[PDB]
Design an enzyme around this catalytic site. Structure first.
Site, short mmCIF file in Angstrom:
data_model
loop_
_atom_site.label_atom_id
_atom_site.label_comp_id
_atom_site.label_asym_id
_atom_site.label_seq_id
_atom_site.Cartn_x
_atom_site.Cartn_y
_atom_site.Cartn_z
N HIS A 43 59.72 109.88 77.64
CA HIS A 43 59.58 110.99 76.63
C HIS A 43 58.31 110.80 75.80
O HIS A 43 57.83 111.78 75.20
CB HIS A 43 60.83 111.11 75.73
CG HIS A 43 60.84 110.14 74.59
ND1 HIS A 43 61.50 108.93 74.66
CD2 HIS A 43 60.20 110.14 73.39
CE1 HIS A 43 61.32 108.25 73.54
NE2 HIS A 43 60.53 108.98 72.73
N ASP A 99 65.04 107.38 80.88
CA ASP A 99 63.88 107.57 80.00
C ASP A 99 62.94 106.37 80.19
O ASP A 99 62.97 105.40 79.40
CB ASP A 99 64.34 107.74 78.56
CG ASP A 99 63.23 108.17 77.63
OD1 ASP A 99 62.11 108.42 78.11
OD2 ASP A 99 63.47 108.15 76.40
N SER A 193 60.01 104.26 69.59
CA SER A 193 60.11 104.80 70.97
C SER A 193 59.16 104.11 71.95
O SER A 193 57.99 103.88 71.67
CB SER A 193 59.89 106.30 71.02
OG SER A 193 61.05 106.99 70.58
#
Lengths: 245, 34
Positions: A43, A99, A193
């Site tokens: 992502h 992911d 992230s």
């Protein structure tokens, strides 16, 4: 991170910073798994609703960094990307299932005191270490300190993770973080992230990358936990990408 | 094959390689014993 502590020099030598070129700023965390392969979250690179579709020539990696505000003369290293591989089953539409992305470095990085790859878990290690109540470690940047931050977080039971979010949680995911009654004692944020969730093996005292920060429901949001890609579950794909190059 | 990766993977030059402990790793190992 929130309520983290300052990393020691060389404490996370597999830490990678994924930067945009214009503006030249930190996009995401990442991890070094060999002299030419870096792991991150899909992502961070690909999210079509937000017109996020980075290519190899949009990005650079910085490796060996302790400080986000100084060029670390004779420590830090820079690399361009040769190739991005997003997991073919990456599900951005529903829940960020799978992911994960692999990035191939244009030139291999020299290892040093400050630059060294993390291990990826085997089935045995994942079975032993990836259990509720056991703690691993997330590294990232304060969401205010200028140096790499460290947070140690407990793995959450599978039913409790599922109950804490509206997102459909898959077996390719795990969640970690303190319970609400524990209070403020450290958290991984959406901003962390792509970075690694690592655990130190009591068997061989190696560090293993068990997770990738996929999303955070705490910090700047009213939710409870962070959600991680389960690296062991995607390890066949990782090996296939590296072997088939 | 890549396999298990670098023979040396996950051993830090300034910590494991020198028998030095970082400031918070004992909290991780203690969580396995509980």
């Amino acid at each position: 991170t929130v309520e983290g502590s300052d990393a020691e020099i060389g404490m996370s030598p597999w830490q990678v910073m994924l930067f945009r070129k214009s503006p030249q700023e930190l996009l995401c965390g990442a991890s070094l798994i060999s002299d030419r392969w870096v792991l991150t979250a899909a992502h961070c690179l690909l999210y079509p609703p937000w017109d996020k579709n980075f290519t190899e020539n949009d990005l650079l990696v910085r490796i060996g960094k302790h400080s986000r505000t100084r060029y670390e003369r004779n420590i830090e290293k820079i690399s361009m990307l040769e190739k991005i591989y997003i997991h073919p089953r990456y599900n951005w539409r529903e829940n960020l299932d799978r992911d994960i992305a692999l990035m191939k470095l244009k030139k291999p990085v020299a290892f040093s005191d400050y630059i060294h790859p993390v291990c990826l878990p085997d089935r045995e290690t994942a079975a032993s270490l990836l259990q509720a109540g056991y703690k691993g470690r997330v590294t990232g940047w304060g969401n205010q300190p200028s140096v790499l931050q460290v947070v140690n977080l407990p793995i959450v039971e599978r039913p409790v993770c599922k109950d804490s979010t509206r997102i459909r949680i898959t077996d390719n995911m795990f969640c970690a973080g303190y319970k609400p009654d524990e209070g403020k004692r450290g958290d991984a944020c959406e901003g962390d992230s792509g970075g690694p969730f690592v655990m130190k093996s009591p068997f061989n005292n190696r560090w293993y990358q068990m997770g990738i920060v996929s999303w955070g429901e705490g910090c700047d949001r009213d939710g409870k936990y962070g959600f991680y890609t389960h690296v062991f579950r995607l390890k066949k794909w990782i090996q296939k990408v590296i072997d088939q190059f | 094959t890549f396999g298990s990766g670098e023979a040396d993977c996950g051993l830090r030059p300034l910590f494991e390689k020198k028998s030095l402990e970082d400031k918070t790793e004992r909290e991780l190992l203690e969580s396995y014993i509980d």
